[PDB]
Amino acid sequence: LFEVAWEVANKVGGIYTVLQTKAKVTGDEWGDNYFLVGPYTEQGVRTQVELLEAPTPALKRTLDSMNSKGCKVYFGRWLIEGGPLVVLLDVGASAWALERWKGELWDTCNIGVPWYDREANDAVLFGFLTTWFLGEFLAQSEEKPHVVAHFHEWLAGVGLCLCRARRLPVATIFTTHATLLGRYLCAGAVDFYNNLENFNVDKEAGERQIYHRYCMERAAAHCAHVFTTVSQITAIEAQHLLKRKPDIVTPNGLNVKKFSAMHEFQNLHAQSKARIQEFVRGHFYGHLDFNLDKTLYFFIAGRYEFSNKGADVFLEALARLNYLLRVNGSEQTVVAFFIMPARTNNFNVETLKGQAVRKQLWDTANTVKEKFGRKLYESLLVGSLPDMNKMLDKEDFTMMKRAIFATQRQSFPPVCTHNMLDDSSDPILTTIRRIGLFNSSADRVKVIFHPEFLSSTSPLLPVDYEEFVRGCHLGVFPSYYEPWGYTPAECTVMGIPSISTNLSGFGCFMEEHIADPSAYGIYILDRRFRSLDDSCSQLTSFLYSFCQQSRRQRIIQRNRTERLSDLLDWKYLGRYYMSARHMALSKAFP
Amino acid sequence: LHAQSKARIQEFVRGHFYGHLDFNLDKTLYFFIAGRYEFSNKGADVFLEALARLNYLLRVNGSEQTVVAFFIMPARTNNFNVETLKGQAVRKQLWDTANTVKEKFGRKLYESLLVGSLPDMNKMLDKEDFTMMKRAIFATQRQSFPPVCTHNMLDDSSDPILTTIRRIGLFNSSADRVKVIFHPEFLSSTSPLLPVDYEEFVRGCHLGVFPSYYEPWGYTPAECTVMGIPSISTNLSGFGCFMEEHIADPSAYGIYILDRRFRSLDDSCSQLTSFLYSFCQQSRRQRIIQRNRTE
Amino acid sequence: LFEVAWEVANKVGGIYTVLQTKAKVTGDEWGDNYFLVGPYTEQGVRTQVELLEAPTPALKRTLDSMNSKGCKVYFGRWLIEGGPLVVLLDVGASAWALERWKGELWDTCNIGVPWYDREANDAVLFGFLTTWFLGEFLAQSEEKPHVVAHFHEWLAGVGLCLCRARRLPVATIFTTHATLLGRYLCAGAVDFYNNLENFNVDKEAGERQIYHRYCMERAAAHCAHVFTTVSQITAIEAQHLLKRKPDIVTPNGLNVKKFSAMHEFQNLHAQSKARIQEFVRGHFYGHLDFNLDKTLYFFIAGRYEFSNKGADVFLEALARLNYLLRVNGSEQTVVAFFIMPARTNNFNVETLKGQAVRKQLWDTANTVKEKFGRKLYESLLVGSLPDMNKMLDKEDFTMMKRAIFATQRQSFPPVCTHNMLDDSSDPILTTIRRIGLFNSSADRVKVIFHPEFLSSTSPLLPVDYEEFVRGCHLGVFPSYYEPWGYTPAECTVMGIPSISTNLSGFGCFMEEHIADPSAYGIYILDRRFRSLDDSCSQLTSFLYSFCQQSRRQRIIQRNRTERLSDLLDWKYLGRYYMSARHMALSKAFP
Ligand SMILES: O=c1ccn([C@@H]2O[C@H](COP(=O)(O)OP(=O)(O)O)[C@@H](O)[C@H]2O)c(=O)[nH]1
Ligand SMILES: O=c1ccn([C@@H]2O[C@H](COP(=O)(O)OP(=O)(O)O)[C@@H](O)[C@H]2O)c(=O)[nH]1
Ligand SMILES: O=c1ccn([C@@H]2O[C@H](COP(=O)(O)OP(=O)(O)O)[C@@H](O)[C@H]2O)c(=O)[nH]1
Ligand SMILES: O=P(O)(O)OC[C@@H]1O[C@@H](O)[C@H](O)[C@H](O)[C@H]1O
Ligand SMILES: O=P(O)(O)OC[C@@H]1O[C@@H](O)[C@H](O)[C@H](O)[C@H]1O
Ligand SMILES: O=P(O)(O)OC[C@@H]1O[C@@H](O)[C@H](O)[C@H](O)[C@H]1O
Ligand SMILES: OC[C@H]1O[C@H](O)[C@H](O)[C@@H](O)[C@@H]1O
Ligand SMILES: OC[C@H]1O[C@H](O)[C@H](O)[C@@H](O)[C@@H]1O
Ligand SMILES: OC[C@H]1O[C@H](O)[C@H](O)[C@@H](O)[C@@H]1O
Known part of the structure; x- marks a missing residue:
């Protein structure tokens, strides 16, 4: 072979x-x-x-x-x-x-x-x-x-x-x-x-x-x-x-990583979401005015194709969902990532500075933490319950005040983590600034454009692609034209609900293999029999419906989506290659 | 306190010179000149000329000693540059990767010791952790030289310090025996990089060079000597004059008094270079004794 | 050779x-x-x-x-x-x-x-x-x-x-x-x-x-x-x-460990004293009613000879010093160690239990410490200075109360860390119980008998002999008969002041090599021209005089004692062996 x-x-x-x-x-x-x-x-x-x-x-x-x-x-x-x-x-x-x-x-x-x-x-x-x-x-x-x-x-x-x-x-x-x-x-x-x-x-x-x-x-x-x-x-x-x-026909499969327990992908999601939360705390420093337990991480990955990977419709749906979340008085917030490689020169000062101040606050809290732990250990050794006011002196309050003042920020967090050499011609940034999304305090959705493939050895976001995808909550891939679609495939393999399309090979494959989709986290989105505006409205409805369900419903949906990994396994999908090899052998020489 | 602060400065240096740690850090001496941004009054031109000359002598002498010279003079900036923050980030990314391999190794070693068998040291590390160490090493590879200014100044074509630095041909190269770091801001304990206030950083350095031409008294050498750091004052300074007639035979207590009244500019630069080289030649024990005498 | x-x-x-x-x-x-x-x-x-x-x-x-x-x-x-x-x-x-x-x-x-x-x-x-x-x-x-x-x-x-x-x-x-x-x-x-x-x-x-x-x-x-x-x-x-x-005459020397800095032995003393403080906190659990900054660690080491190594006079002086410290209303306390190997069977339950509860309190304080640090990190990320009462809930106060109750102890801490198989015939324990020293709350001196050589791989006190000696404050060796004396020699080499005798080879050697001893930490104690009671009184006076000096005086005294290491170096003391070899060669065959 x-x-x-x-x-x-x-x-x-x-x-x-x-x-x-x-x-x-x-x-x-x-x-x-x-x-x-x-x-x-x-x-x-x-x-x-x-x-x-x-x-x-x-x-x-x-x-x-x-x-x-x-x-x-x-x-x-x-x-x-x-x-x-x-x-x-x-x-x-x-x-x-x-x-x-x-x-x-x-x-x-x-x-x-x-x-x-x-x-x-x-x-x-x-x-x-x-x-x-x-x-x-x-x-x-x-x-x-x-x-x-x-x-x-x-x-x-x-x-x-x-x-x-x-x-x-x-x-x-x-x-x-x-x-x-x-x-x-x-x-x-x-x-x-x-x-x-x-x-x-x-x-x-x-x-x-x-x-x-x-x-x-x-x-x-x-x-x-x-x-x-x-x-x-x-x-x-x-x-x-x-x-x-x-x-x-030869559908594309994946090497699913089977774990000794069914729920291990949930633990991986928890750890990866904790890492994403650390990144978000770094990026939104001085602007952590929203609950992080009500934060959902959406993302669209793959090569930088705007109209083919479905990034314009995703951004329109994000703006509409932001409008509904604002007018509904909702405490939920959504952080949407955009992993599409565009040439940059390096990171911008704001993002690296934000990570730096986040971990500077972490160090200051750590220092106060060891001082408090030593005083508490002395109190417990003596045998007296702390009265909680004799431990912290004026100096550590002074440095906490100085740290809080140092993290004060008047500008809004940036939408792009890197410094791109052409911002006036980038479709993503152009439509982001057109739809009026700038990670403001009033904005219920926050957009983070990471114009680079994720890697485990990056100065910020030290997560490879699979770990980051495991950490997210919903992968939106409303691709107009693409033959099969890998990103939703491993999203569903790793348990993350995904939004595919009926113009996609993955969406078509999952369409006739399961009765009543969208009950397994596969939000199939019609783009063939609907106009662009109708598709955007349907995407907004899907996003809002995902937003309304509670934590238990999200966990159940992730379980159901993970249960479909056997469909895309190479064990089940490898028979077509064997058939093709057999036909080739029969045609060439028995 | 000097040891701890020098450890923190070493962490900063490892961050700044990432992918270029080709020099021994135990042979590294930290000089600095602080105060307000006066070029000809605080004596920054003569210090830079002496730094270039000392670099030339250290190169032609085949010395393993290296000198990192800091310049704490506030000039208006806009923010840090990407290179310095990125360098700190990759330094602590390497720290995290080494930490991860460290916990894995510690757990395997703990299992081995619980069993009762001495490690053979080759059964512990698998292919994945070698793979991530290789990836981390590749990620830290760098072709450009480390920057001389930690911040992004809005006027680099008119800054005297950067102008003379690029004139005397000092760019933190591999061949350069002296590395210049210009930090155009007062030090603070709550900074994203260099989380040290001024006193701690001064305690961490090895020699404070303040060849000020005109200044009435001079505080920076005063607290340098209070905190034990040897200093290079001048006979045109109030501190230098005060210590001149209060101690018999100065420069035996770390107070390198430098004559700027009876000597020309070139002669003063030569004397400063001689003082810097003389400080360089003495070993660790001599440095400790000198710090004791200065304190 | x-x-x-x-x-x-x-x-x-x-x-x-x-x-x-x-x-x-x-x-x-x-x-x-x-x-x-x-x-x-x-x-x-x-x-x-x-x-x-x-x-x-x-x-x-x-x-x-x-x-x-x-x-x-x-x-x-x-x-x-x-x-x-x-x-x-x-x-x-x-x-x-x-x-x-x-x-x-x-x-x-x-x-x-x-x-x-x-x-x-x-x-x-x-x-x-x-x-x-x-x-x-x-x-x-x-x-x-x-x-x-x-x-x-x-x-x-x-x-x-x-x-x-x-x-x-x-x-x-x-x-x-x-x-x-x-x-x-x-x-x-x-x-x-x-x-x-x-x-x-x-x-x-x-x-x-x-x-x-x-x-x-x-x-x-x-x-x-x-x-x-x-x-x-x-x-x-x-x-x-x-x-x-x-x-x-061939005086016995030592291989002094020279450090790049003169004061490194002070740092070693600090670290080793911290380890000894951890051991003391373990041993005196539920009885930490005395300041640990006013605690001085005396010790007498070597082979288990009672009347030859001078352990009876040391214990009499300890009892007398306890009486003076009690009647003087002093906040100083003295912990005296006795490192003399006597056959045991294992440790006693009390000492291992004390170390266990000490580190259990350490773990509980650690847990409260991480919880407090995480809450403080959240507060600093938000940007609000802590009000210090919203962080700790009822559960962690409950477990601190339970830990404090668990460490309550009614019996006094033991004087022997091991379980000796003959307590009715041990001279040290006999005289300890005779002089009425039981580590009580009123007692100003606390005696710890460790009937074993110190080792770095012991379940308790994981310090070898040199580190422990570096951690102590004063080595008392009032030996009646012993030829030279190594323990005071390395005590002075490592900077610890020592109490030697004029009947000792070390005391005699340092007697005529330095003008006015006891100004360099060498408290030479006369046992030849004085009776037993007078020697005990002089030892008590020396111990009290060491007790009265402050921290600065102790540091200066340790510096002066360390300065005498060159006298006992093998470089200076090795010439006598060379002379002996030369005489042997001359006598046997040139
Ligand atoms: O940050 C990223 C984003 C995407 N991918 C990979 O890119 C592929 C996307 O392939 P797809 O078929 O979805 O579209 P393509 O990019 O091949 O046109 C997936 O397999 C991912 O593993 C990646 O490695 N890192
Ligand atoms: O990073 C720095 C550099 C300098 N200083 C202070 O600036 C003073 C320098 O005063 P000096 O008399 O040397 O000259 P001046 O700057 O007043 O002209 C010293 O006291 C330092 O404490 C500081 O706080 N942070
Ligand atoms: O816990 C201990 C106590 C003593 N020693 C050693 O025992 C020796 C004591 O010798 P000395 O001449 O004082 O009397 P000896 O015990 O030989 O009669 C010293 O060198 C110590 O190093 C030891 O190794 N561990
Ligand atoms: O991020 P969410 O949708 O709120 O899911 C919440 C988390 O999901 C999984 O990772 C685990 O079950 C965690 O125990 C749970 O806390
Ligand atoms: O930085 P150096 O000149 O080499 O001094 C070396 C250090 O000096 C002091 O901080 C201490 O004595 C340290 O123990 C010593 O290692
Ligand atoms: O144990 P003390 O006699 O109180 O000595 C106090 C300690 O002595 C030395 O170890 C060091 O100088 C320490 O910095 C000092 O705290
Ligand atoms: O069809 C298989 C996959 O790989 C193809 O090369 C395309 O890049 C991608 O869109 C497609 O989904
Ligand atoms: O003379 C006292 C100090 O403060 C003065 O205001 C000057 O700024 C400084 O150069 C002088 O050394
Ligand atoms: O004299 C040398 C040393 O070793 C001897 O063997 C004795 O055990 C000891 O007391 C003496 O001090």
């Missing part, structure tokens, strides 16, 4: 997660005949990969057959023990002969990549290197086994045509997880779901680009022995646009 | 400390030609010794020359890096032929050991083994060097006669640190210092025993090329009783 892809060592939301979750089961069920191919980027990928430059059995012949011939191929383990013997390929090591590879592409399939975008050039170069490695392996192994080559996305789709030109006896499977042409039309301010058969692919390809990419994608789909897509909705645009109906 | 002795691996107050302190300088000045010989006891001595059974250079010939011949010889390092290549000898391994060794002793010097005491039989067996090892080494080394053999005490004195019988060409030095006959006459309720020339050695030897021991000691003194003693007072009884005037 060869699961060649571009995201194996570099962290990107797509491809990387599905491969990392699949590797364990796909290796334990099959064995050491599982091989993974990907690129090399000088970004720290070697930190997570245990490279094996020295010769190693289980395809030891290529190391002394081709490595010392002007190429660069490594063998790694990934630090994940699913037996993922990964074949890492360097991109910049072999780039001096791009002209001959372009000529080879011209001879074979009249395709290639223009010099405008280096991403696709690197993808094609990696495809050439992968094809050379696979051919060398077949030559060295005397063609005794019939290996199956599987391809993900267009970043590794040139392998299909390269192998078909050379007629290598392998079973070809191609699985596209996102028709990028659909992605770039859905961002073109044009309706995409009302009609699909009225699109002219060649006319649209090129004004927004995606002409060579579309051509190579369709060539791979046609020439691949087995074609596959993520959701049933994915197959719909695949057969209507690429004119190649997928052989079988 | 061969510093053969019985206390090299087993912990005994004498011999062990002097050898362990000397080894560093005597090895750094000379080198790897330094060899140490001692016995083997199955008591954990191998834990502190890195045995080298495998062959090792620097006398590698004996390992393959004699070890595989029915004997048992090891090579060790001691874990002390003074280069102490120690030659460890097993005692029980070679004991099957004691009859032939007894016959050899009869042939050589008409000496030996009767079967009443196994200590001296083991000593003689170890002496035979040492002589065999030394002879084998000379045979293997072709007698190229002229090694010097030095002997300590009568536990290794048979080596002198054994080597003299065989006429081995070595330079013999013998250093007796205690004339044991003097020790056992001074405990016989007979005056010993008024006259020395009127004693009949043979008549006294045997009724109290020490006949064979005395004979072999005097034979070693006569036959040794160089004879040496600890103090000038030691030489006095040596020449008047053994009839062999020592060649030179």
